[PDB]
Design a protein around this ligand. Structure first.
Ligand code: CLA
Ligand code: CLA
Ligand code: CLA
Ligand code: CLA
Ligand code: CLA
Ligand code: CLA
Ligand code: CLA
Ligand code: CLA
Ligand code: CLA
Ligand SMILES: CC1=C(/C=C/C(C)=C/C=C/C(C)=C/C=C/C=C(C)/C=C/C=C(C)/C=C/C2=C(C)CCCC2(C)C)C(C)(C)CCC1
Ligand code: SF4
Lengths: 73, 741, 140, 143, 73, 219
């Protein structure tokens, strides 16, 4: 139990750090002129689709998992 | 000059045009909802009558009619209570055997298996077990029939209609002028004499003629269906004479000043009735007669349309001394022109009164068979404690509001308000030192106990087994109160409460009230109470004092009472307003009252409540408060883990609902954190992405979804936090006390 | 009519008022006659007096409440504890002096350095005299 | 041309009973501020440090700690009294600056002869990219 | 622990704390050690046992080698 | 029960990723702050204008996502621990029937397994599990402290500290000691960091104490 929980918490923190440093890359080291038309620019182009679909997936999962738990309860 | 009645005829026309158009009262709210913030501000500013009109006359009229509406709502509520007692309650069955039938007054329907909630309370009945103490109240009144509850409910409905009609009439047909409202001397004369005074006198008359013979016969022990109806006792002094012989002499002793002859129903006894566990109704009769006379005397002080009397202004202006400059000069003008000043005073005094009520009702149960009803005890105490705390925080909020809006420095020059505002840093500095010192010497004591217990050095921790901290002053006061009857209370036959000392009052095999001992744990919890109270008063007092200005933001009152911040400048000015001070004071009041009710619950379940086994009292928890309350682990294990066993194991029973709310409240509280840790910007950009998704499918609203304002985010967060916490404690208390006790 | 609360120095725009606690002649005399508020006296001697008072004051808590209070040998353990407390507060004084005085003759680099030395030899002395008072006092 | 007025040290102060929000140790080591105005009647006003003072007929002087307190007091005067005042900055060595009515004309009215400091002639997104200015000891909005 | 891997609680390090009472010193003497000790929940005993380390001299040799290696880095 | 818990895990991963991805992409500028890259990765806000811009920087997205990471890993470890605690005792039925509703989690897991942990020290003595009981309460204290920084914000504290500064500069026998650094309340972003650090440390310590004392106690 100790080893599993230890490595799981370590992994969670490291994932948060990976995303934090991706954000820092975008704020600091991202050059639109060099990265023009590549997959990085293209994924910045339609960010609203990504954010809205993450929002839908999370809303669905939360609504339904909570609803089933509450119904059973 | 000369107090009189002044009204305007038909000031307002009774139409429905303004209901069709929301937001009519406020100029800013008008011109359509461009964004949802309009929808929120429509409700947030509905009763803020100050921002709808600057005329104090119109503000006062709106307040008058709103009070009538509130009275109508309260009468609807009372009518509902009495009607449910009349129809869906086992009151008539509970009267015969009040010791074994569990009070109930709400049945549920069959619709989705919720029928299980119908408890097997008793009397051949099934329903939810009420804890509002209405059965004991009705028995103390002397009801003993379900027709009388129906009559009372219908009368309360008629009176609710009367209240609503009165509100409509006094806003739309005959509305008072402003100079009517400002007759504070006449209003005080009528609220001392007419309201409280004549009300107490009328209640004493009722008890003498209804509640006293009926309850005498019930306490002697009679099936209620044979007892004469109250009008029979009232109308002939023969029956009362057989019960209370002094009624054979009539009113002649009263007008002859031979009042001692009324000693058989105007007693001074104290203590509890051994058969019911409540105060003697003769004692309460005498109490109400006495205070009715005292209030009638009090209601003649102030001057009105005749020369005799004192003036509030003259009395206030004459109390000035060397340390205060002008003293109370200008207090009269800032009390009869600002409603928020009166609201602060009245809310503070009302919350303190509610808390006093809670105390005086657990210690000295005033209704028959109410001490033995442990659920009613706990519920009534906790309810009045929470109501008092909320009212006190409201007093703080409205003191701040008055300090922001209705305070002008022209009339408040070198008077008491000016003197206080002119040295606020000293007050706040010293109050913060007191909070620090109390926090250390209250919580660090618990932490020292915890550390010594975990280290295996119980000879070092503060406890009765080691370093003692004994409440010498509280114990001395308890002893002094015990020694009163016959010494300093020569005409009192027994102590006012069996909590000072003496014997154990037990009713129906259940303890009603036994002496409460104070030791080291009681010392520690009382200092915890002092610490929490002091931090709460610090927050609210600092908000009131620095409402206007601050060395950080001198023009704060220009930003209003309720504003989020003042930019990230000066290092950050988040939550600098008075409203945010109220927002934090709510959290601290919650903490304070929660610790108070935890202390009451554990102390009563460990040192008072229990069953008498013909050889000693066997308390519910067995006395573990005296030895386990000294440590935080003791509270987490011997009170919160241990006593939660009745709520988490409630599934499939009648208390199953308390098992759901206990969980459900845990949700709401946690949900509140969403609003308290987050900020508006994240939500605005998230909503921007959501709105793009809607735009792509032509379903965007024409009303802009806007994230909640900063102030509203904080308000929603605190509302949810308080709701979740209070509901958790309420369900836990109720399930615990309805499964044991 | 008795005006007890006035602004300090008669100037109402300084963050003080003179009050029957701040300016009453008894309190003013008592504080001015305290060793700290004596600019004229040599800083070493004022440190000596302060250390004497504070070292002697500081013994009692550990004597009556230390971990080894119930054992008879508590007096000497506590004398050691108070010597250590005075020593630590001494290095506090040195850090403060070496920080605040780097760019009342007490408020100077050499004035404080001597005052820190005077606090030493007097501070340990009260921790020593406190031990002797435990072994010599009749009443104790 | 314009000539800022001279700070007359011997000026009556408002009738004030003493406050706990007045000057502190910062006014003896750094610097403090002085505000001077001229009252057409002796009237009660609200001093930004809590409490109420009475301003006297004629010239009045009042010294505070922060500049912003002085400007808050001056805004109160301009709105509720229509009184125009002057804010000087006093150093503890004796030096005196003249602050708020810098050109005699208030900051909201064009004076024609003022310096256009810190006025970029580009929009808000026309600034440089942080990657281009990396390791420069500045921010994108000052190039 | 090598002899009885299933009936021995692996010891982490010794406890030296001058605040302990006598009962705590009694309660923390566990896996056969002479004084109070901590029981390891890191699973390093199993790892070192599996990879070939059997005696304490080998553990000490590894510690010395790794100390020198850290100095070299 | 495994179905329900795996979907809870899916909710956690998706919401944490939503916060992190949104803060990473919405970091060069939003509709609310079109020039956010001019301010850097971390900054407090953009004043109370335009409705209010609290927690607007990308650093605040990381801040808000750390809570969700903690919650999600807590769900994962709760699931693993209860599944295997049923496994190791041979009583698979307790989980398999009690894990389909939340009161089963609250009662048959948190409440039941906490009996030995909270009994580590008590008025009748202590055992080896006293250190874990103390650590349990210690983590509770740290987490509860972190709420102070998370809920209260710089503005009450600045005025309070400043009144304290008046008190210290102005009291006899203490005017002889002055601060070299002017005491100011923690900054906004710093306070968010402090509250988050307390939250995480308390979370980790509390769960570690519960896990070690609930597994080593029974086995
Ligand atoms: C290989 C791993 C790695 C590396 C090399 C870096 C490197 C860097 N990071 Mg980063 N980061 C990482 C992982 C990593 N990170 C992870 C896993 C996370 C998720 C938590 C983050 C989240 C993160 C953020 C949000 C930020 C950085 C920033 C930075 C830069 C400056 C760091 C700094 O400010 O120092 C300062 C170090 C500290 C202030 C330490 C704080 C104290 C810690 C967090 C808690 C202490 C409590 C303690 C453990 C309690 C004791 C326990 C006991 C009491 C029980 C730097 C280049 C900053 C940056 O780039 O600026 C734009 C920035 O803001 N990182
Ligand atoms: C128990 C606490 C709690 C709960 C329930 C939530 C729930 C949620 N969070 Mg949240 N969060 C929390 C704590 C919590 N959080 C904390 C402490 C933080 C740190 C500040 C965050 C930070 C955070 C961020 C940054 C984000 C979320 C998001 C979300 C949403 C994710 C979508 C979803 O799961 O849909 C499921 C929906 C629900 C579970 C809500 C339940 C539905 C209700 C109960 C039904 C209504 C019934 C009834 C009509 C209620 C009204 C009755 C009353 C008026 C009388 C969701 C609503 C994300 C989001 O915004 O989504 C897009 C988002 O990005 N959270
Ligand atoms: C404090 C105010 C209050 C509250 C909280 C309740 C609450 C309740 N009442 Mg009620 N009641 C009240 C006042 C109140 N009452 C008053 C003043 C009267 C006097 C007329 C009644 C007369 C009354 C009757 C006769 C009944 C209830 C019933 C009920 C229960 C079901 C309500 C329902 O589902 O209606 C239905 C929801 C609707 C929207 C229908 C409303 C339409 C009604 C007929 C007109 C009002 C509009 C419920 C717990 C029922 C009950 O006891 O269940 C066993 C029942 O039959 N009440
Ligand atoms: C049916 C009779 C009637 C009619 C037609 C009107 C009509 C009008 N009144 Mg009114 N009034 C009435 C009765 C009536 N009143 C009564 C009985 C009272 C005594 C309380 C008042 C007191 C009163 C005041 C103080 C004011 C008005 C005002 C007005 C005007 C606009 C304000 C308005 O009501 O907007 C819309 C109001 C509503 C759509 C309904 C109000 C919400 C109700 C009261 C909720 C009741 C509480 C309820 C229990 C909800 C709480 C809990 C809930 C969750 C269950 C409008 C022309 C205002 C005015 O003069 O113009 C500026 C004004 O301020 N009235
Ligand atoms: C004997 C005289 C008398 C009595 C009994 C009352 C009683 C009351 N007044 Mg009142 N008042 C009086 C004189 C009186 N007043 C005078 C002379 C003035 C002029 C200054 C005022 C001005 C005044 C104001 C401005 C307000 C009150 C309010 C109230 C109510 C307090 C709220 C409450 O819940 O209390 C306890 C509730 C009860 C005891 C229930 C009893 C209800 C009955 C029906 C009372 C009706 C008696 C009525 C005052 C007598 C004349 C009515 C008749 C003309 C039809 C209360 C019912 C407040 C209020 O609630 O607004 C309505 C309020 O805002 N009064
Ligand atoms: C407002 C309170 C109140 C009211 C309405 C009554 C009403 C009544 N009392 Mg009474 N009484 C009261 C208070 C009250 N009492 C108190 C506080 C005491 C203690 C001193 C007494 C002691 C008392 C005695 C000893 C007797 C009564 C009696 C009576 C009845 C006949 C007197 C009468 O008709 O004149 C009514 C006058 C008015 C309604 C007001 C006009 C003046 C009557 C129904 C007599 C009776 O019939 O016994 C049952 C009787 O002998 N009372
Ligand atoms: C006699 C008591 C009393 C009265 C008459 C007032 C009157 C007033 N208050 Mg006030 N207040 C009080 C007590 C009182 N307060 C108390 C006890 C507190 C402490 C909590 C406060 C704290 C307070 C604050 C902080 C503020 C006011 C404000 C106001 C003014 C506007 C109120 C408004 O319209 O908001 C609109 C009404 C609502 C938004 C209704 C929602 C209120 C909460 C969310 C309801 C809680 C839910 C409920 C318990 C049910 C929960 C169950 C759920 C599942 C449905 C108004 C004149 C505001 C002001 O600006 O003053 C000028 C202001 O900001 N009050
Ligand atoms: C468990 C969480 C927690 C804790 C420990 C505190 C603690 C404190 N709060 Mg706080 N608060 C909290 C939650 C918490 N709060 C939350 C969630 C909120 C949001 C509503 C607030 C909002 C709030 C406000 C608005 C205010 C406070 C204030 C205070 C301080 C009051 C002084 C005192 O209590 O005396 C003493 C301090 C303690 C008893 C803390 C425990 C320390 C132990 C017992 C002793 C210390 C010795 C230590 C163990 C040895 C050092 C070890 C070494 C390694 C360093 C205090 C430090 C008030 C303040 O600033 O001062 C008046 C203030 O006004 N709080
Ligand atoms: C925790 C606080 C504490 C404790 C445990 C003690 C304990 C003690 N003090 Mg002490 N003291 C204290 C605070 C304390 N003091 C403070 C705050 C002051 C002054 C501000 C003094 C000033 C003082 C003096 C002057 C003397 C003592 C003395 C004593 C010793 C004998 C007391 C007696 O029995 O008579 C005793 C061991 C007497 C002694 O003989 O010292 C050893 C003695 O002469 N105390
Ligand atoms: C079935 C199976 C298989 C397959 C598998 C697969 C298919 C896999 C995978 C995988 C995956 C799929 C993985 C992943 C993960 C991911 C992650 C983990 C993420 C991430 C990202 C990030 C973190 C980002 C960052 C950033 C930002 C944010 C910005 C920009 C850019 C950067 C990068 C900087 C096999 C046959 C082999 C085996 C058996 C089973
Ligand atoms: S974070 Fe919010 S409350 Fe704080 S300064 Fe910025 S806008 Fe104002």
């Amino acid at each position: 139990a100790a080893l599993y929980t230890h490595h799981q918490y370590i992994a969670g923190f490291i994932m948060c750090g990976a995303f934090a440093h991706g954000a820092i890359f975008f704020v600091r080291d991202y050059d639109p002129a060099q990265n023009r038309g590549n997959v990085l620019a293209r994924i910045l182009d339609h960010k609203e689709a990504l954010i809205s679909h993450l929002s839908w997936a999370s809303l669905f999962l939360g609504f339904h998992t909570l609803g089933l738990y509450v119904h059973n309860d | 000059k000369k107090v009189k009645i002044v009204v305007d005829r038909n000031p307002v026309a009774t139409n429905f045009e303004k209901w069709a158009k929301p937001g009519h009262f406020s100029r800013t709210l008008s011109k359509g909802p461009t964004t949802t913030t309009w929808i929120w501000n429509l409700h947030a500013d509905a009763h803020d009558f100050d921002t709808q009109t600057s005329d104090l006359e119109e503000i006062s009229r709106k307040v008058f009619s709103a009070h009538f509406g509130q009275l109508g709502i309260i009468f609807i509520w009372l009518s509902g209570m009495y009607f449910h007692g009349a129809r869906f309650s086992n009151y008539e069955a509970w009267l015969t055997d009040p010791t074994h039938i569990k009070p109930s007054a709400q049945v549920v329907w069959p619709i989705v298996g919720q029928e299980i909630l119908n408890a097997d309370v008793g009397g051949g009945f099934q329903g939810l077990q009420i804890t509002s103490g209405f059965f004991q109240l009705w028995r103390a009144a002397g009801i003993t029939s379900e027709l009388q509850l129906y009559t009372t409910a219908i009368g309360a409905l008629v009176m609710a209609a009367a209240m609503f009609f009165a509100g409509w009439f006094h806003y739309h047909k005959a509305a008072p002028k402003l100079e009517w409202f400002q007759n504070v001397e006449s209003m005080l004369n009528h609220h001392l004499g007419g309201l409280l005074g004549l009300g107490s006198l009328a209640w004493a008359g009722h008890q003498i003629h209804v509640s006293l013979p009926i309850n005498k016969l019930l306490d002697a022990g009679v099936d209620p269906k044979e007892i004469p109806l109250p009008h029979e006792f009232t109308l002939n002094p023969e029956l009362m004479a057989q019960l209370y012989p002094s009624f054979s002499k009539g009113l002649a002793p009263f007008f002859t000043l031979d009042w001692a002859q009324y000693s058989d129903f105007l007693t001074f006894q104290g203590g509890l009735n051994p058969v019911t566990g409540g105060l003697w109704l003769t004692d309460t009769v005498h109490h109400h007669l006495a205070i009715a006379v005292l209030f009638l005397i009090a209601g003649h002080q102030y001057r009105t349309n005749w020369g005799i009397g004192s003036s509030l202004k003259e009395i206030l202006e004459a109390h000035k001394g060397p340390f205060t400059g002008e003293g109370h000069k200008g207090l009269y003008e800032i009390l009869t022109t600002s409603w928020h000043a009166q609201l602060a005073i009245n809310l503070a005094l009302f919350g303190s009164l509610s808390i006093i009520v809670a105390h005086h009702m657990y210690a000295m149960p005033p209704y028959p068979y109410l001490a033995t009803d442990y659920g009613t005890q706990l519920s009534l105490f906790t309810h009045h404690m929470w109501i008092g705390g909320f009212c006190i925080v409201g007093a703080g909020a409205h003191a701040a509001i008055f300090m922001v809006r209705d305070y002008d420095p022209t009339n408040n020059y070198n008077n008491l308000l000016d003197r206080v505002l002119r040295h606020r840093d000293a007050i706040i500095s010293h109050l913060n030192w007191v909070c620090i010192f109390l926090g250390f010497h209250s919580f660090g004591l618990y932490i020292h106990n915890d550390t010594m217990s975990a280290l295996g050095r119980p000879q070092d921790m503060f406890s009765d087994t080691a370093i003692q901290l004994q409440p010498v002053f509280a114990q001395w006061v308890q002893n002094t109160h015990f020694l009163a009857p016959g010494f300093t209370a020569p005409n009192a036959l027994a102590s006012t409460s069996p909590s000072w000392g003496g014997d154990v009052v037990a009713v129906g095999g259940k303890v009603a009230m036994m002496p409460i001992s104070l030791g080291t744990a009681d010392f520690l919890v009382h200092h915890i109470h002092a610490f929490t109270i002091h931090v709460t008063v610090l927050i609210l007092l600092k908000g009131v004092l620095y409402a206007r200005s601050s060395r950080l933001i001198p023009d704060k009152a220009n930003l209003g009472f309720r504003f989020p911040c003042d930019g990230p400048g000066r290092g950050g000015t988040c939550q600098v307003s008075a409203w945010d001070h109220v927002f934090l004071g709510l959290f601290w009041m919650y903490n304070s009252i929660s610790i108070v009710i935890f202390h009451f619950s554990w102390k009563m379940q460990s040192d008072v409540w229990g069953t008498v086994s013909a050889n000693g009292v066997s308390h519910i928890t067995g006395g573990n408060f005296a030895q386990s309350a000294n440590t935080i682990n003791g509270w987490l294990r011997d009170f919160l883990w241990a006593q939660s066993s009745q709520v988490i194991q409630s599934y499939g029973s009648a208390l199953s609902a308390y098992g759901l709310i206990f969980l459900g409240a845990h949700f709401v509280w946690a949900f509140s954190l969403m609003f308290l840790f987050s900020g508006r910007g994240y939500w605005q950009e998230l909503i921007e992405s959501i709105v793009w998704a809607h735009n792509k499918l032509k379903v965007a609203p024409a009303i802009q979804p806007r994230a909640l304002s900063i102030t509203q985010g904080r308000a929603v967060g605190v509302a949810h936090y308080l709701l979740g916490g209070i509901a958790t404690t309420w369900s836990f208390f109720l399930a615990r006390i309805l499964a044991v006790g | 009519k008795v005006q007890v609360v006035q602004p300090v120095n008669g100037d109402p725009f300084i963050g003080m008022l003179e009050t029957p606690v701040t300016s009453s002649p008894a309190i003013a005399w008592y504080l001015s006659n305290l060793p700290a508020y004596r600019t004229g006296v040599s800083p070493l001697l004022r440190g000596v007096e302060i250390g004497l008072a504070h070292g002697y004051l500081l013994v009692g808590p550990f004597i009556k409440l230390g971990p080894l209070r119930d054992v008879e040998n508590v007096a000497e353990i506590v004398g050691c504890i108070n010597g250590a407390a005075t020593v630590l507060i001494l290095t506090l004084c040195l850090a403060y002096g070496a920080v605040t005085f780097q760019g009342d003759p007490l408020q100077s680099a050499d004035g404080w350095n001597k005052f820190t030395a005077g606090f030493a030899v007097g501070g340990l002395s009260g921790a020593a005299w406190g031990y002797l008072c435990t072994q010599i006092l009749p009443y104790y | 041309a314009f000539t800022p007025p001279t700070l007359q040290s011997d000026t009556p102060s408002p009738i004030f009973g003493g406050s706990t929000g007045g000057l502190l140790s910062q006014a003896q080591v750094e610097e403090f501020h002085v505000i001077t105005w001229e009252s057409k009647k002796e009237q009660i006003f609200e001093m930004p440090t809590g409490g109420a003072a009475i301003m006297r007929q004629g010239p009045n002087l009042l010294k505070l700690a922060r500049k912003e307190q002085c400007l808050a007091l001056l805004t109160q005067l301009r709105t509720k009294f229509k009184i125009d005042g002057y804010i000087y900055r006093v150093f503890p060595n004796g030096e005196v600056q003249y602050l708020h009515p810098k050109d005699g004309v208030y900051p909201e009215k064009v004076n024609a002869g003022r310096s256009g400091d810190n006025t970029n002639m580009r929009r808000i997104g026309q600034n440089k990219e942080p990657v281009q200015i990396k390791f420069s000891g500045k921010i994108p909005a000052e190039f | 622990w090598v002899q009885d891997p299933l009936h021995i609680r692996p010891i982490a390090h010794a406890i030296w704390d001058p605040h302990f009472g006598q009962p705590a010193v009694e309660a923390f003497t566990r896996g056969g050690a002479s004084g109070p000790v901590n029981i390891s929940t890191s699973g390093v005993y199993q790892w070192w046992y599996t990879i070939g380390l059997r005696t304490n001299q080998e553990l000490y040799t590894g510690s010395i080698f790794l100390l020198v290696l850290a100095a070299l880095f | 029960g495994d179905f329900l818990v795996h979907h809870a895990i899916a909710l956690g991963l998706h919401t944490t990723t939503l916060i992190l991805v949104k803060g990473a992409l919405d970091a060069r500028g939003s509709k609310l702050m079109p020039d956010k890259k001019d301010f850097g990765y971390s900054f407090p806000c953009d004043g109370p204008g335009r409705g209010g811009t609290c927690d607007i920087s990308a650093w605040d997205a990381f801040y808000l996502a750390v809570f969700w990471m903690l919650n999600t890993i807590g769900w994962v470890t709760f699931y693993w621990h209860w599944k295997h605690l049923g496994i190791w005792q041979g009583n698979v039925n307790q989980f398999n029937e009690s894990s389909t509703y939340l009161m089963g989690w609250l009662r048959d897991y948190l409440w039941l397994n906490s009996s030995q942990l909270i009994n580590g020290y008590n008025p009748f003595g202590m055992n080896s599990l006293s250190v874990w009981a103390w650590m349990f309460l210690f983590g509770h204290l740290i987490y509860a402290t972190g709420f102070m920084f998370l809920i209260s914000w710089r503005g009450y504290w600045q005025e309070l500290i400043e009144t304290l500064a008046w008190a210290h500069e102005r009291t006899p026998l203490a005017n002889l000691v002055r601060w070299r650094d002017k005491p100011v309340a923690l900054s906004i972003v710093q306070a968010r960091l402090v509250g988050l650090t307390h939250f995480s440390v308390g979370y980790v310590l509390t769960y570690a104490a519960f896990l070690i004392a609930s597994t080593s106690g029974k086995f």
